[PDB]
Scaffold this active site. Sequence first.
Site, PDB file in Angstrom:
ATOM      1  CE  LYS A 115     -24.439   2.243  15.361  1.00 48.93           C
ATOM      2  NZ  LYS A 115     -24.570   1.509  13.863  1.00 48.93           N
ATOM      3  CG  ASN A 138     -23.999   6.398  19.102  1.00 48.60           C
ATOM      4  OD1 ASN A 138     -23.464   7.100  19.186  1.00 48.60           O
ATOM      5  ND2 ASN A 138     -24.015   5.580  17.617  1.00 48.60           N
ATOM      6  CG  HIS A 183     -18.380   5.601  10.902  1.00 43.31           C
ATOM      7  ND1 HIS A 183     -18.470   6.474  11.382  1.00 43.31           N
ATOM      8  CD2 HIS A 183     -18.757   4.224  11.489  1.00 43.31           C
ATOM      9  CE1 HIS A 183     -19.944   6.527  11.603  1.00 43.31           C
ATOM     10  NE2 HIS A 183     -19.520   5.166  11.826  1.00 43.31           N
TER      11      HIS A 183
HETATM   12  N1  LIG Z   1     -12.978  18.370  20.122  1.00 41.11           N
HETATM   13  C1  LIG Z   1     -13.768  17.566  19.036  1.00 41.11           C
HETATM   14  C2  LIG Z   1     -14.800  17.022  18.313  1.00 41.11           C
HETATM   15  C3  LIG Z   1     -16.203  16.646  19.089  1.00 41.11           C
HETATM   16  C4  LIG Z   1     -17.278  16.553  17.731  1.00 41.11           C
HETATM   17  C5  LIG Z   1     -16.661  16.848  16.386  1.00 41.11           C
HETATM   18  C6  LIG Z   1     -18.138  16.847  14.918  1.00 41.11           C
HETATM   19  O1  LIG Z   1     -19.088  16.224  15.938  1.00 41.11           O
HETATM   20  C7  LIG Z   1     -19.391  14.729  16.243  1.00 41.11           C
HETATM   21  C8  LIG Z   1     -19.582  14.566  17.812  1.00 41.11           C
HETATM   22  C9  LIG Z   1     -19.911  13.134  17.896  1.00 41.11           C
HETATM   23  C10 LIG Z   1     -19.640  12.297  17.484  1.00 41.11           C
HETATM   24  C11 LIG Z   1     -20.851  11.177  17.393  1.00 41.11           C
HETATM   25  C12 LIG Z   1     -20.657  10.323  16.443  1.00 41.11           C
HETATM   26  C13 LIG Z   1     -20.483  10.181  15.288  1.00 41.11           C
HETATM   27  S1  LIG Z   1     -20.823   8.817  14.460  1.00 41.11           S
HETATM   28  O2  LIG Z   1     -20.592   9.290  12.991  1.00 41.11           O
HETATM   29  O3  LIG Z   1     -20.674   8.065  15.285  1.00 41.11           O
HETATM   30  N2  LIG Z   1     -22.389   9.133  13.602  1.00 41.11           N
HETATM   31  C14 LIG Z   1     -22.218   9.863  12.014  1.00 41.11           C
HETATM   32  C15 LIG Z   1     -23.723  10.842  12.083  1.00 41.11           C
HETATM   33  C16 LIG Z   1     -24.272  10.741  10.341  1.00 41.11           C
HETATM   34  C17 LIG Z   1     -25.269  12.057  10.689  1.00 41.11           C
HETATM   35  O4  LIG Z   1     -26.215  11.913  11.788  1.00 41.11           O
HETATM   36  O5  LIG Z   1     -25.719  12.382   9.387  1.00 41.11           O
HETATM   37  C18 LIG Z   1     -22.270   8.763  11.701  1.00 41.11           C
HETATM   38  O6  LIG Z   1     -22.606   7.337  11.318  1.00 41.11           O
HETATM   39  O7  LIG Z   1     -22.010   9.721  10.772  1.00 41.11           O
HETATM   40  C19 LIG Z   1     -20.580  11.300  14.369  1.00 41.11           C
HETATM   41  C20 LIG Z   1     -19.698  12.327  15.491  1.00 41.11           C
HETATM   42  C21 LIG Z   1     -19.629  14.365  15.821  1.00 41.11           C
HETATM   43  C22 LIG Z   1     -15.852  17.195  16.173  1.00 41.11           C
HETATM   44  C23 LIG Z   1     -14.417  17.837  16.991  1.00 41.11           C
END
Ligand SMILES: N#Cc1ccc(COc2ccc3ccc(S(=O)(=O)N[C@H](CCC(=O)O)C(=O)O)cc3c2)cc1
Length: 433
Positions: A115, A138, A183
């Site tokens: 993406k 994102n 996820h």
């Molecule tokens: N209230 C509250 C609160 C907000 C954030 C968090 C943890 O904080 C975040 C914030 C925003 C995010 C937005 C998107 C994602 S994500 O899942 O789409 N991206 C990860 C990132 C992986 C990585 O960077 O290794 C994934 O694909 O697994 C993770 C996030 C994690 C905990 C509590």
Amino acid sequence: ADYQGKNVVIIGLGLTGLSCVDFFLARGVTPRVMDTRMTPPGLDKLPEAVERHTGSLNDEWLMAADLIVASPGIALAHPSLSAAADAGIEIVGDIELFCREAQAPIVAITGSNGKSTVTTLVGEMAKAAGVNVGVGGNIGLPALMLLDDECELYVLELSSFQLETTSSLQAVAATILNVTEDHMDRYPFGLQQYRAAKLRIYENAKVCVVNADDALTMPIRERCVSFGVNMGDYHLNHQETWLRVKGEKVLNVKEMKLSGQHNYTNALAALALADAAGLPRASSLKALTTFTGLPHRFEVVLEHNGVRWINDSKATNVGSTEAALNGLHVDGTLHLLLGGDGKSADFSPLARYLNGDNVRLYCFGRDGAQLAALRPEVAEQTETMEQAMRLLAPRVQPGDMVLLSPACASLDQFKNFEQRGNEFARLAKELGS
Ligand SMILES: N#Cc1ccc(COc2ccc3ccc(S(=O)(=O)N[C@H](CCC(=O)O)C(=O)O)cc3c2)cc1
């Protein structure tokens, strides 16, 4: 929309939560912020006159609100949010606030893998055409920081989480590139619930672009434009490989700097979306030939002494790692780093790539032991990624590859996958000369 005099609560700081704060303030509305983390990532970066609550969600604040703005990182299913939804309190996210204001067409992209590459590609295709384009979402900048009356197109990467809280998106072109397990720690109703969130991107979209090879990218019930390997409105032709649109050759892939089949289907998807958005084809194809790749995406950070060290830190799921291993050519031994927060994924799919004599596994982070189980006879388990590197380095031989493509999020030990990829690059440099 008009937010004048409303009680606004933003859940979750960070870049995004900060951009929402700025959005309301510039509009004459002081929101309040809350975060379940005692010390959230942009806390000391936040204006003084903004009330904040940390260390937990505040139900008093929630139940009083006229509008809740929820970070994609908090689950809608969280008991405090569910309660506020039950009371009729309106819940949106940053993409939704963005879509209600934007005065240019949006290309909207989602999927389990590819993406950001497609989003970037469609952004360069508009740049090559002299179009003033904002690229983000994102990836890169949070959407709300792209908003500008002068902008002529928006290209947005959108996660499943962003899509759950968005309702006013009417994209000129939308795609789901693919859907494979990811996820699952946020989707207790499994793969179909995860897909359902992604399917929201096609609602009110002018053209929808599906992957002919992945049925899950298709709406439940005109048709969508498709891309595919042997089939699709946009497809590959192997004499040497060409991209073709309906039987017409448009580009010989040797003109691209990227390679691999999955990059060539990324190029197809990007083209299809640019086409739907009205961008001229010549300049679109020109951008394909100039794009060198994103960092942390199968990136060669060091090739030296007969050894290639690849940062594929952006591999945060099982699908992405498969993409790296499937058809991968290694002369000698592959030293594969796996590890971090597997988000309850099934790692099995990886097993069929780990046979033969020329593979070694170095497994680390929260789910390290589960990743080693895949083939324990060729596997070591450490706590950290650093320790793993220092353990594989000595065994590295001319002809070998060292591949960080961990299949997991980094967030158990790192800030984000970029920090993990940068640490790997630094160590590969130390250890590899
Ligand atoms: N209230 C509250 C609160 C907000 C954030 C968090 C943890 O904080 C975040 C914030 C925003 C995010 C937005 C998107 C994602 S994500 O899942 O789409 N991206 C990860 C990132 C992986 C990585 O960077 O290794 C994934 O694909 O697994 C993770 C996030 C994690 C905990 C509590």
